[PDB]
Amino acid sequence: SGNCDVVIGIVNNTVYDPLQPELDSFKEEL
Amino acid sequence: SGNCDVVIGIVNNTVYDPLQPELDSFKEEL
């Protein structure tokens, strides 16, 4: 919701997405 | 849940899939 320029006290990190790792697992392994 | 023939007042639209375009993203990745 929104962006980083409105909230007070936001910090920097990375949010893990389960779709991409799962994707690589399917095609290469075959 | 269910289908369109039981509810009263249902309208027609399209429901966006976050996975449908992302499966095409998988196609690209391949």
Ligand SMILES: *[C@@H]1O[C@H](CO)[C@@H](O[C@@H]2O[C@H](CO)[C@@H](O)[C@H](O)[C@H]2NC(C)=O)[C@H](O)[C@H]1NC(C)=O
């Ligand atoms: C969180 O990270 C962003 C970068 O993703 C930081 O944004 C930078 O802010 C400085 C100061 O205004 C700019 O000089 C940089 O150009 C910005 N980066 C980019 C990529 O534009 C942000 O300051 C970070 N916030 C904290 C609290 O560390």
Ligand SMILES: *[C@@H]1O[C@H](CO)[C@@H](O[C@@H]2O[C@H](CO)[C@@H](O)[C@H](O)[C@H]2NC(C)=O)[C@H](O)[C@H]1NC(C)=O
């Ligand atoms: C919502 O859309 C569906 C089609 O997806 C409509 O169903 C049609 O209904 C008429 C009237 O009974 C039929 O002649 C058509 O054959 C139906 N379409 C299909 C593809 O079978 C439905 O009427 C729409 N509802 C509203 C409220 O607009």
Ligand SMILES: *[C@@H]1O[C@H](CO)[C@@H](O)[C@H](O)[C@H]1NC(C)=O
């Ligand atoms: C929290 O308080 C410190 C002072 O202890 C201040 O430097 C900092 O900017 C404050 N952060 C926020 C989000 O208010």
Ligand SMILES: *[C@@H]1O[C@H](CO)[C@@H](O)[C@H](O)[C@H]1NC(C)=O
């Ligand atoms: C809502 O009311 C209108 C009359 O103003 C009627 O034509 C319509 O069929 C009604 N719809 C439902 C879902 O009851």
